[PDB]
Design a protein around this ligand. Structure first.
Ligand code: IZP
Length: 139
């Protein structure tokens, strides 16, 4: 083994905690999440952990609601069971330094974008005309 070099996604690596969430309930409604799930998922305050190992990116989310973990290679689709229990087909790419996560299921699609803004990691969840913004800071 030799030690690898860095990459642009290193800006994302680390441990992040949710500090603010706007219009997430409306997002979840638009996605089709049911009442009891929305209310408990909307109350969650996740720690999000992003790591890189070679070509593989891992995103872990930990909360009192659910713990999730996905591992992927940019541009390479995978199967994902989401925290709300949708079975989706997911592809995650970089677009100009934004991590773009598209989920497809049941003829529907939603996009989750992650972007660095100052010391924060901003998450933008989009379902048709409904957007939710979630802001994370370093743990
Ligand atoms: C319909 C919802 C429950 C799916 C969902 C949206 C956003 C996240 C992460 C990015 C988050 O910020 O918690 C996780 C799950």
């Amino acid at each position: 083994q030799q030690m690898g070099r860095g990459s642009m996604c290193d800006a994302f690596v680390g441990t992040w905690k949710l500090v603010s969430s706007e219009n997430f309930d409306d997002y979840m409604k638009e996605v089709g999440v049911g009442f009891a799930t929305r209310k408990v998922a909307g109350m969650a305050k996740p720690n999000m952990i992003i790591s890189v190992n070679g070509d593989v990116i891992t995103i872990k989310s930990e909360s009192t609601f659910k713990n999730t973990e996905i591992s992927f290679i940019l541009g390479q689709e995978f199967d994902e069971v989401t925290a709300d229990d949708r079975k989706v087909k997911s592809t995650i790419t970089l677009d100009g330094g934004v991590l773009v996560h598209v989920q497809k299921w049941d003829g529907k699609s939603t996009t989750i974008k992650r972007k660095r803004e100052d010391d924060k990691l901003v998450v933008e969840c989009v379902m048709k005309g409904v957007t939710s913004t979630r802001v994370y800071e370093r743990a």
